[PDB]
Short mmCIF file of C-alpha atoms and ligand atoms in Angstrom, two decimals:
data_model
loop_
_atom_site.label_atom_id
_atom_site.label_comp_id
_atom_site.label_asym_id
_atom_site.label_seq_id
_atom_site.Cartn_x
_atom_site.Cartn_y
_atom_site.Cartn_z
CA UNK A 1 -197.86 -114.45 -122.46
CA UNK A 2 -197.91 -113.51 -118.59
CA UNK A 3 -195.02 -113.80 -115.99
CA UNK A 4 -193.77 -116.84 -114.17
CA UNK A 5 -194.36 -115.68 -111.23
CA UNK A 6 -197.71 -114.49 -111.02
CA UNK A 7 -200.39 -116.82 -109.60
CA UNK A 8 -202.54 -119.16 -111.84
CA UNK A 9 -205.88 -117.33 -112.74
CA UNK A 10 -209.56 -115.16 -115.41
CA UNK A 11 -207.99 -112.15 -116.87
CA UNK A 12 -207.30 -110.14 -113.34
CA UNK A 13 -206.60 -110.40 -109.84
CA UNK A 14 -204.91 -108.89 -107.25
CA UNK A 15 -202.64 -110.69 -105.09
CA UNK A 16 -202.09 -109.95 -101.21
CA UNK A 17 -197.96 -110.25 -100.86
CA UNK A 18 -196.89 -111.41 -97.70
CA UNK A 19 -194.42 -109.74 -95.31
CA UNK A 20 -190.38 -111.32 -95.53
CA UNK A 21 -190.67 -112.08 -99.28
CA UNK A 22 -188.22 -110.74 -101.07
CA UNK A 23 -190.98 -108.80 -103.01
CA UNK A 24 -193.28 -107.67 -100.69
CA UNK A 25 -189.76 -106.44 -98.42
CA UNK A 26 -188.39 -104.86 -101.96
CA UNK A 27 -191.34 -102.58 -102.29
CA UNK A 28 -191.69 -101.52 -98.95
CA UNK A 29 -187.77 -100.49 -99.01
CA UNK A 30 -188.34 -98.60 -101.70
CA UNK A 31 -191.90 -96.93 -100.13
CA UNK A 32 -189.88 -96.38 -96.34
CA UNK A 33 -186.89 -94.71 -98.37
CA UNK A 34 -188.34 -91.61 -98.35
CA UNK A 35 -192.01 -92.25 -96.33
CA UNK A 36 -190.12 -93.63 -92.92
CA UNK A 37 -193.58 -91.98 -91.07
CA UNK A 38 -196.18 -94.02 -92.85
CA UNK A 39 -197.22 -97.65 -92.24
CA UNK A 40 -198.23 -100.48 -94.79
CA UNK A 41 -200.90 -102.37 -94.22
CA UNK A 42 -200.78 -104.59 -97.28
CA UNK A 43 -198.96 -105.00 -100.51
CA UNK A 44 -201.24 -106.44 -103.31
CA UNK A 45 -199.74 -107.90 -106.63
CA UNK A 46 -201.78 -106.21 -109.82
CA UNK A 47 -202.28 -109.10 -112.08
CA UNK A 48 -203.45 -107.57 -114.80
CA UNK A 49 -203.12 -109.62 -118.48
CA UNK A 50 -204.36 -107.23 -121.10
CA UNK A 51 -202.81 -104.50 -119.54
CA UNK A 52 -199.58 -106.19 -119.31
CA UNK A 53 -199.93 -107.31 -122.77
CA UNK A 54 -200.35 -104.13 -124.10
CA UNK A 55 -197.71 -102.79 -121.99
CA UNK A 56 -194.97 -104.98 -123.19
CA UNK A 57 -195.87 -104.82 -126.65
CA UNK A 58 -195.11 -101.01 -126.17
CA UNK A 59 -191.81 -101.66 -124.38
CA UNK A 60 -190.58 -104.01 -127.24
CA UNK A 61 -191.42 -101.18 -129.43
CA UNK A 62 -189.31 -98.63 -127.31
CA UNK A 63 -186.62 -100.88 -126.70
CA UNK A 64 -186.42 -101.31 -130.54
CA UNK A 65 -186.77 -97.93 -131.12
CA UNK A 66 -184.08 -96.16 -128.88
CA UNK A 67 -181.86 -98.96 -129.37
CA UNK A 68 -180.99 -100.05 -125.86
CA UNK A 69 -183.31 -101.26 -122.82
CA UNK A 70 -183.16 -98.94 -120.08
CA UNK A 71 -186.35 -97.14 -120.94
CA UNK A 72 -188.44 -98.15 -118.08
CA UNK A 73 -188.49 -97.25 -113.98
CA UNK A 74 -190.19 -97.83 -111.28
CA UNK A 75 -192.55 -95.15 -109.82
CA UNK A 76 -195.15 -94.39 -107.71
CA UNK A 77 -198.70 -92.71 -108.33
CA UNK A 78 -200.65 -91.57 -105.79
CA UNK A 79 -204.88 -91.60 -106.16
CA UNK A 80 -207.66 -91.45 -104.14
CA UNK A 81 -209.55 -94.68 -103.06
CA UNK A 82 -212.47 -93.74 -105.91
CA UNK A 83 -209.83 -94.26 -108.63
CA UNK A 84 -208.30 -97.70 -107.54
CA UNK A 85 -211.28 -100.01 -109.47
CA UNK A 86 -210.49 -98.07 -112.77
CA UNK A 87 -206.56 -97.98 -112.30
CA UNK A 88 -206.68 -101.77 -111.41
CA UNK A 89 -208.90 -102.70 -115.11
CA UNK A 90 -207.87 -100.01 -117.32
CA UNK A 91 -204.11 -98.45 -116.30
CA UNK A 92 -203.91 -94.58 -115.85
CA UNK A 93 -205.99 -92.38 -118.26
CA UNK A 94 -204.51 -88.96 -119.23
CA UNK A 95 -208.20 -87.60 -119.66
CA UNK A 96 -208.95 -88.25 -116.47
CA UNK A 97 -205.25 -86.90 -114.35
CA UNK A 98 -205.90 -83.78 -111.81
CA UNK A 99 -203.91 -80.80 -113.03
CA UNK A 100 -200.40 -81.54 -111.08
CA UNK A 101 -199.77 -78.12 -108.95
CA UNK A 102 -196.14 -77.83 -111.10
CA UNK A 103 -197.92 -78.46 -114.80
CA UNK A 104 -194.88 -80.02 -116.93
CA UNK A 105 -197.98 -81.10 -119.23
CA UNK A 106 -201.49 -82.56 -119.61
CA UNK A 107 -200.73 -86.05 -118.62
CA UNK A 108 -200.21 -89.10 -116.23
CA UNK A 109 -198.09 -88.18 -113.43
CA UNK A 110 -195.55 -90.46 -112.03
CA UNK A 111 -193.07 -89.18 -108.62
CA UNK A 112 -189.45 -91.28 -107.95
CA UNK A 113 -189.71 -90.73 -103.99
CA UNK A 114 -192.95 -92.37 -102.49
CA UNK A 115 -192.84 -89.15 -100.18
CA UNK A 116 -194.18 -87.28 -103.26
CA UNK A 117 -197.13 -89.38 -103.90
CA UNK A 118 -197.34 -89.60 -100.21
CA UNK A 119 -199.34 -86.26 -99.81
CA UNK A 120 -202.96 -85.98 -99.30
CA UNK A 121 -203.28 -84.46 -102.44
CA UNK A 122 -202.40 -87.44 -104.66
CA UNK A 123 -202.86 -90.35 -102.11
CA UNK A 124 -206.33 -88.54 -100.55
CA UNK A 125 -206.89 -90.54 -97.30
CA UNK A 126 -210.41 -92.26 -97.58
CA UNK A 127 -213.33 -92.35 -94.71
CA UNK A 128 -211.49 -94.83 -92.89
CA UNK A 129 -207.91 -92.79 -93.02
CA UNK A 130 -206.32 -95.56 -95.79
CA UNK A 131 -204.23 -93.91 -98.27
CA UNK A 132 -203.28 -95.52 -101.70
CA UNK A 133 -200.05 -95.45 -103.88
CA UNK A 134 -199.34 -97.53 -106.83
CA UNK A 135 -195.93 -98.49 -107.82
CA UNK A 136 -195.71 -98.61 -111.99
CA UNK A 137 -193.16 -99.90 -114.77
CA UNK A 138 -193.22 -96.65 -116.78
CA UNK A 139 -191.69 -96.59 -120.12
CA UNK A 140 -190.08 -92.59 -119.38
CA UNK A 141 -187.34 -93.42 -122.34
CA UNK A 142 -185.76 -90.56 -123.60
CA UNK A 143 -187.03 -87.49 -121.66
CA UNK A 144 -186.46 -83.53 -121.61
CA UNK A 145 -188.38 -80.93 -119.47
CA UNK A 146 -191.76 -80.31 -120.06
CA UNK A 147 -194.34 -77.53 -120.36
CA UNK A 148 -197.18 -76.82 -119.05
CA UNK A 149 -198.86 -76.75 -122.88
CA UNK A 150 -197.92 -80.04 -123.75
CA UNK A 151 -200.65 -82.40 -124.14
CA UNK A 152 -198.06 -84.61 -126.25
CA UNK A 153 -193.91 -85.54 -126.05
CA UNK A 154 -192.24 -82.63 -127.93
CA UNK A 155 -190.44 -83.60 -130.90
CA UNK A 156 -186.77 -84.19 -130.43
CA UNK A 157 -185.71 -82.28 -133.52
CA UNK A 158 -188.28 -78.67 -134.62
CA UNK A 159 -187.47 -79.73 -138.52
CA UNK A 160 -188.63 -83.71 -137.95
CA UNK A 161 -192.35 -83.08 -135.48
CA UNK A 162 -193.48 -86.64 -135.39
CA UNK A 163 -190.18 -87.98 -133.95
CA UNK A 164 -191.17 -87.47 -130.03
CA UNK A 165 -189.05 -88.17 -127.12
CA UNK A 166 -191.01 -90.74 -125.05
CA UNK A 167 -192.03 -88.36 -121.75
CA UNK A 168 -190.77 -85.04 -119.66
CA UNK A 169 -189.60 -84.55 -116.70
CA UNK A 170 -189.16 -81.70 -114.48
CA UNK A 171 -185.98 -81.67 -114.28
CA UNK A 172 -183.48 -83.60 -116.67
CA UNK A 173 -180.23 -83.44 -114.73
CA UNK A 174 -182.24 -84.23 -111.21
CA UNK A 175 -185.08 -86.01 -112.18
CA UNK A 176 -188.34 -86.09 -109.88
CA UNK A 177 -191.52 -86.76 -112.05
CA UNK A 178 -192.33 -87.78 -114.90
CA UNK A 179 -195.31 -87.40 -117.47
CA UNK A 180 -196.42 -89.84 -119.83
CA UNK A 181 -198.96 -89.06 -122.63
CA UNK A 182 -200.26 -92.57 -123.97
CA UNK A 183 -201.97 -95.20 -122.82
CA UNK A 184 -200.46 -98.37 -122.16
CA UNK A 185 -197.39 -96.87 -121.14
CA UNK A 186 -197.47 -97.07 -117.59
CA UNK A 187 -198.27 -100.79 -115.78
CA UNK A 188 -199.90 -100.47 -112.40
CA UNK A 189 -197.43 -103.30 -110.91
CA UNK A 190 -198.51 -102.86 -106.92
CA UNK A 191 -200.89 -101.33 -105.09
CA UNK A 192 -200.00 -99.81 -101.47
CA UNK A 193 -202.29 -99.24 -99.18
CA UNK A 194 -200.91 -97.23 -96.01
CA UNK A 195 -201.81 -95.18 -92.96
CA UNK A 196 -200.43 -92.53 -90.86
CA UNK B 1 -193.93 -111.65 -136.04
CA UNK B 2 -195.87 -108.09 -136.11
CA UNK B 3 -198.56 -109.97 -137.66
CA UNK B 4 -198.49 -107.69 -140.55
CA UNK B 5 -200.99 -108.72 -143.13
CA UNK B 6 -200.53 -110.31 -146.34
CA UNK B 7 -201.27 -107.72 -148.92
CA UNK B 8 -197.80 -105.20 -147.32
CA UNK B 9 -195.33 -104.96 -149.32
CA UNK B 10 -191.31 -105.30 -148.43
CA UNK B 11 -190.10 -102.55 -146.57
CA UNK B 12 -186.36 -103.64 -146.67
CA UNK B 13 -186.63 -104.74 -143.01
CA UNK B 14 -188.07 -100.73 -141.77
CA UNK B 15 -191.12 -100.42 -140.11
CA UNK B 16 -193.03 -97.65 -141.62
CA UNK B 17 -194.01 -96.73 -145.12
CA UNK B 18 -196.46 -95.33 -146.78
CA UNK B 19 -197.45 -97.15 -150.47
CA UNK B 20 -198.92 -95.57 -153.36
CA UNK B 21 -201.57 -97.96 -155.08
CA UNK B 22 -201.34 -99.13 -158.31
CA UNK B 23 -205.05 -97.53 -159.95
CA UNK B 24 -206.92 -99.98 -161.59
CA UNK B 25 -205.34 -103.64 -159.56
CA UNK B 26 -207.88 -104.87 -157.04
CA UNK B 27 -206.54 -103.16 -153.63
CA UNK B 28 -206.92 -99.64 -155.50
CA UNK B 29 -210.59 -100.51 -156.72
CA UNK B 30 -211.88 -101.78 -153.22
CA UNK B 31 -210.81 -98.65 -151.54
CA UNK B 32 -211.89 -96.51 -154.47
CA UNK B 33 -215.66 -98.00 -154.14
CA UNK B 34 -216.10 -97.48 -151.06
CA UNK B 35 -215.14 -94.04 -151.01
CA UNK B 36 -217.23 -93.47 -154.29
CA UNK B 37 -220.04 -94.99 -152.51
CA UNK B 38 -220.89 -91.60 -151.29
CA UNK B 39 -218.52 -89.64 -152.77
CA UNK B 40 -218.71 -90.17 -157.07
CA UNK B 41 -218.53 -86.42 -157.26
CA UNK B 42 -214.95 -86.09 -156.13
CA UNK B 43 -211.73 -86.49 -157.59
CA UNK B 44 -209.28 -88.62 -156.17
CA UNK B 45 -205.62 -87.61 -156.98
CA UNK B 46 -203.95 -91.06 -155.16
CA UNK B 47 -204.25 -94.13 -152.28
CA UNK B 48 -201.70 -94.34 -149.80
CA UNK B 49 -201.13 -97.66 -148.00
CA UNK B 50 -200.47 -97.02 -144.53
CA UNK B 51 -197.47 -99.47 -143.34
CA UNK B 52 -197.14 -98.62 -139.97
CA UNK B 53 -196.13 -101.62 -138.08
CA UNK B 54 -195.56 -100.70 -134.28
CA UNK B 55 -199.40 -99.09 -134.81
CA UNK B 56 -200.48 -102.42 -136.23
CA UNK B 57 -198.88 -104.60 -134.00
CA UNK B 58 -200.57 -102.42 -130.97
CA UNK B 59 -203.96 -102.27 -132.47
CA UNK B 60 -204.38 -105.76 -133.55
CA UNK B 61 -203.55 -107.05 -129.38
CA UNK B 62 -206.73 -104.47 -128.76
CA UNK B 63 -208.71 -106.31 -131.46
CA UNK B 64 -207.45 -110.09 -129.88
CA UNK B 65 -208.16 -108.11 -126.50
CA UNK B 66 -211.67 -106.94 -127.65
CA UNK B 67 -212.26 -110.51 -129.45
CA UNK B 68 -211.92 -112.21 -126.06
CA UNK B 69 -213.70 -109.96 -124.09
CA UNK B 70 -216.82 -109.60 -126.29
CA UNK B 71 -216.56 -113.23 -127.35
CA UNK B 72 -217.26 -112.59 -131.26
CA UNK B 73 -215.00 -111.11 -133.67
CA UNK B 74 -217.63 -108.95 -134.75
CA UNK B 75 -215.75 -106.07 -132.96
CA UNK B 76 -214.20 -104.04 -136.27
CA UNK B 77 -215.51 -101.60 -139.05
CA UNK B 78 -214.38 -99.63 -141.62
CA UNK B 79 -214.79 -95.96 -141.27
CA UNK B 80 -213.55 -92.67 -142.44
CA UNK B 81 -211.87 -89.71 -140.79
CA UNK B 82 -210.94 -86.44 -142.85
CA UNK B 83 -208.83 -84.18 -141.66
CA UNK B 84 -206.54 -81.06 -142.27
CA UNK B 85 -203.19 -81.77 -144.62
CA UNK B 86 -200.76 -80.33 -140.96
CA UNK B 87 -201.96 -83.54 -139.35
CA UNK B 88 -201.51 -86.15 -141.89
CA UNK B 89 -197.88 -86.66 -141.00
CA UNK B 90 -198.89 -87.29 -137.01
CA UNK B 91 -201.80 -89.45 -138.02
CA UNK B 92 -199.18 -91.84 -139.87
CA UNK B 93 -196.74 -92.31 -137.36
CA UNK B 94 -199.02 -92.61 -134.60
CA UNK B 95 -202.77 -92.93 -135.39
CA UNK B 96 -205.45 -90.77 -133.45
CA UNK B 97 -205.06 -88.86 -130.48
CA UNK B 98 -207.87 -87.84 -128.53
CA UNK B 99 -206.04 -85.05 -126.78
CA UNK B 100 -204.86 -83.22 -130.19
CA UNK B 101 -205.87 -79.96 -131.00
CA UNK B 102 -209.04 -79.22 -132.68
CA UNK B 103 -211.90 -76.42 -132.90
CA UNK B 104 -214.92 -79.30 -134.31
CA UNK B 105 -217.75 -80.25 -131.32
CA UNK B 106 -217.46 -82.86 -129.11
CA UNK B 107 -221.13 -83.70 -128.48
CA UNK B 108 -220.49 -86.90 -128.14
CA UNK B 109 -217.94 -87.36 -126.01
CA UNK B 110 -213.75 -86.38 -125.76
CA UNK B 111 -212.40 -89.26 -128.21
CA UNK B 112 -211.86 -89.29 -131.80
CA UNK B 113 -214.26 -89.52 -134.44
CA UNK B 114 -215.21 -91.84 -137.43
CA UNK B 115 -217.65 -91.41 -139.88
CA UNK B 116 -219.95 -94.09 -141.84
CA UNK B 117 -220.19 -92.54 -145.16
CA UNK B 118 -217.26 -90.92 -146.47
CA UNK B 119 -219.10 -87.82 -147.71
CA UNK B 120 -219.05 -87.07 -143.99
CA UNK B 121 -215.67 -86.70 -143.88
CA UNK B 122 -215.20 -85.03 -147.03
CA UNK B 123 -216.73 -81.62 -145.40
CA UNK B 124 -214.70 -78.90 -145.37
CA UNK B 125 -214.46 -78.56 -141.42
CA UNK B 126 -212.39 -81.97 -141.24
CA UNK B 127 -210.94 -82.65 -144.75
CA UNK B 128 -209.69 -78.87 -144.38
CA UNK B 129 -208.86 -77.98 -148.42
CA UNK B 130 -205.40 -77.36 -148.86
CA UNK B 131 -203.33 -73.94 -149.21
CA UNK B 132 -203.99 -76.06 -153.10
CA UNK B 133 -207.09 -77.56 -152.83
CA UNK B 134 -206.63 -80.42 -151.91
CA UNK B 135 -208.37 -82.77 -149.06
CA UNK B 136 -207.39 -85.83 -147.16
CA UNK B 137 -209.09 -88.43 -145.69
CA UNK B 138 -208.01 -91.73 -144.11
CA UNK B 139 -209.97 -95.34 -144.26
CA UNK B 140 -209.96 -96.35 -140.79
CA UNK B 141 -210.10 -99.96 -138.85
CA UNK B 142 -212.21 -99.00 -135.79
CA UNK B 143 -212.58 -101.32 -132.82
CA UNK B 144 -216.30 -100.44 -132.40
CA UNK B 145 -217.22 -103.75 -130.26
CA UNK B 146 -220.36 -103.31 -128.34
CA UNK B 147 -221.62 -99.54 -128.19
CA UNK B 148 -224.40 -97.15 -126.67
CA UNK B 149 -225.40 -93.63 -127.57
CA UNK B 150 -222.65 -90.98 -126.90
CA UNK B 151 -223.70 -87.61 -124.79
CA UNK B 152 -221.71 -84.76 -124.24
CA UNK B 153 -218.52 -84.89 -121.43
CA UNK B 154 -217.75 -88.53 -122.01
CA UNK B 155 -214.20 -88.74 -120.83
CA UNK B 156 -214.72 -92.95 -121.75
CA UNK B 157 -217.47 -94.90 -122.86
CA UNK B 158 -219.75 -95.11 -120.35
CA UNK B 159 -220.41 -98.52 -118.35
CA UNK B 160 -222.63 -101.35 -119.41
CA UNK B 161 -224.13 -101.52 -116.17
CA UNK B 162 -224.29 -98.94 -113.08
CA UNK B 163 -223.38 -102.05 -110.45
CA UNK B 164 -219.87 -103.08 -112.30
CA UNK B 165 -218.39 -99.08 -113.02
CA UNK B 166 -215.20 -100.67 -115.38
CA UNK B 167 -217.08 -102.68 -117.38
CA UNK B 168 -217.10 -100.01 -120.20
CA UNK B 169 -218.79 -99.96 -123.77
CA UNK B 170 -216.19 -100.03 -126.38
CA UNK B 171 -217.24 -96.84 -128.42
CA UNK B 172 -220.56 -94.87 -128.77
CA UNK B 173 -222.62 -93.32 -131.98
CA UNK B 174 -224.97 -91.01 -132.63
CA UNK B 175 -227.71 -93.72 -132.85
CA UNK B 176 -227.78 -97.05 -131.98
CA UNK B 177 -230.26 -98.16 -135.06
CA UNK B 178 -228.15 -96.44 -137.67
CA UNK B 179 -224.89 -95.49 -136.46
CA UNK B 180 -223.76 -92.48 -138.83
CA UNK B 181 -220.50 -91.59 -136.61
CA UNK B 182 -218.63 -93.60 -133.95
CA UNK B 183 -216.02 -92.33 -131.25
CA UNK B 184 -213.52 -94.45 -129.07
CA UNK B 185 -212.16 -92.75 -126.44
CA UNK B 186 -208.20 -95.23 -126.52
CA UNK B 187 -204.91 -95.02 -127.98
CA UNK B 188 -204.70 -98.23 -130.26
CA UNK B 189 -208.41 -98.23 -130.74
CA UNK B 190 -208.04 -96.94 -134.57
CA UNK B 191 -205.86 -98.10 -137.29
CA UNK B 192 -205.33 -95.44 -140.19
CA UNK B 193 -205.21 -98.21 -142.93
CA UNK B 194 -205.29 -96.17 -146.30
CA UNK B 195 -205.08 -92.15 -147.15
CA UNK B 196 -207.28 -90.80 -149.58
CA UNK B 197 -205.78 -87.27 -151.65
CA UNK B 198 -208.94 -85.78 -152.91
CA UNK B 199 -210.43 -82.49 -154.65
CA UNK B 200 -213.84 -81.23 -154.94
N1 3JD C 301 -214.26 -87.53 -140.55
C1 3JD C 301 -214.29 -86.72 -139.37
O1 3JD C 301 -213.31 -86.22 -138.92
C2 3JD C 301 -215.64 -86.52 -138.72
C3 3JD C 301 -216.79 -86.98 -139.34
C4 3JD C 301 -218.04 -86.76 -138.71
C5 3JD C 301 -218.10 -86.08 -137.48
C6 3JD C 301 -216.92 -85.62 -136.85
C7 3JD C 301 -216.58 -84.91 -135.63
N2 3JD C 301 -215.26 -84.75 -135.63
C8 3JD C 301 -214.45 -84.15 -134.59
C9 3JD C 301 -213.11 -83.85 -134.83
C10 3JD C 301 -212.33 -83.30 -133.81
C11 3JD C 301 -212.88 -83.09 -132.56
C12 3JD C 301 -212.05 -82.51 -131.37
C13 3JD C 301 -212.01 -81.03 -131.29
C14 3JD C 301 -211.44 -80.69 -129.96
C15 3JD C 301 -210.03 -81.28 -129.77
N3 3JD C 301 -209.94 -82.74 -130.10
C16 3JD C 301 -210.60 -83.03 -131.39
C17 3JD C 301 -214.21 -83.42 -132.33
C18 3JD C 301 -214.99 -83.95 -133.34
N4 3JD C 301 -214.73 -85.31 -136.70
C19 3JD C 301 -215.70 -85.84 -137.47
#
């Protein structure tokens, strides 16, 4: 049930992308777009099979649900080095997010420009001055701004509760970030480590 | 397809549905036992099938998951959880959230909890009595696995081993010789499998 193009493994690993492939050059187009100051130093491919199962079981579910299939995007995460083991085995954990300095609710933060995650708040540079930035298939669906209270979606309709939009944003006409509130939701694809 | 077990009914091609039992037919008298088991003094007003099939589907690639990973299929129980009538409706649609709302202790640990016995669950504080009396209580799959004593400020189950940091327990108790409550601390983790309409 895993991708094509993901080495032959064990149930994870994480796969050092090389420069001039059309993958590893994608995601660092996408990372310059905004973070033109930073350098890469490596690319690695999270291979991650239960995660990735459980993942695409809940996009099936959303793309059956909303009744059309542009319900995921690509976004970046910022974390300290301590995080990286658990993000790489387990995916992002709402229990355990930092309060975001704009609260749209009590959940997993995810930024569109790499500049946002860029900042030593999310991506704290380690010891060695190596900072660390995930890029992640996020199933944002149908989204409206959040609220600081939230600690799930709101419901789409007050008179139908259990009927929740699938995450907020800050900002529905402009979109910026996004926060999801379940797990398996969110696919750590690649992890970026960087430098000033 | 979903996987969906045997004993569903049709559901004209939707995807959730709750199902009254039929008193007296097999189904009806397993569920009733075991909740009689602790509970003979109550009166139970009805047993709702729970037909959820996007929270089936989910929890039964955790139980695969947890099958593989423990390498028995030892890694499910049955358990109760009672709770107030408001939440019944979420509970359905989308099974147990550890981040809801709630005033009841969390000594050990921030996940969701399941009792053994179901005269547990039938205390007031979580099968909350209705503006009419009456109490609810669901019969839960639980992916307990491999588990450890809980503490308080568990966030997840903590590791099996100080040297490897992610390789977690799947759930924790309040004792490891006779487990009276367990709590998992995942989305997916819990399948609400039957609800239970009750009085005192
Ligand atoms: N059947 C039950 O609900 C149950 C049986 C035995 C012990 C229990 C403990 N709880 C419990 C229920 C809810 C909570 C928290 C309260 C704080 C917010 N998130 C839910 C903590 C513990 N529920 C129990």
């Amino acid at each position: 049930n895993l991708p094509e193009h993901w080495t032959d493994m064990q149930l994870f690993c994480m796969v050092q992308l090389e420069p001039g492939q059309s993958e590893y050059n994608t995601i660092k187009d996408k990372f310059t777009r905004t973070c033109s100051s930073y350098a890469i130093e490596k690319i690695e491919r999270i291979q991650n099979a239960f995660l990735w199962q459980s993942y695409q079981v809940k996009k099936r579910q959303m793309d059956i649900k909303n009744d059309h299939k542009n319900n995921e995007r690509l976004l970046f995460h910022g974390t300290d080095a301590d995080s990286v083991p658990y993000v790489n085995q387990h995916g992002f954990n709402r229990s355990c997010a930092g309060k975001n300095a704009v609260s749209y609710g009590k959940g997993t933060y995810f930024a569109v420009d790499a500049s946002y995650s860029a900042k030593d708040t999310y991506s704290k540079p380690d010891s060695n001055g190596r900072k660390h930035m995930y890029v992640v298939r996020v199933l944002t669906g149908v989204f409206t701004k959040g609220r600081a209270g939230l600690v799930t979606p709101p419901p789409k309709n007050p008179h139908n509760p259990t009927d929740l939009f699938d995450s907020v944003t800050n900002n529905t006409r402009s979109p910026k970030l996004f926060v999801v509130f379940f797990d398996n939701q969110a696919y750590p694809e690649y992890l970026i480590t960087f430098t000033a």
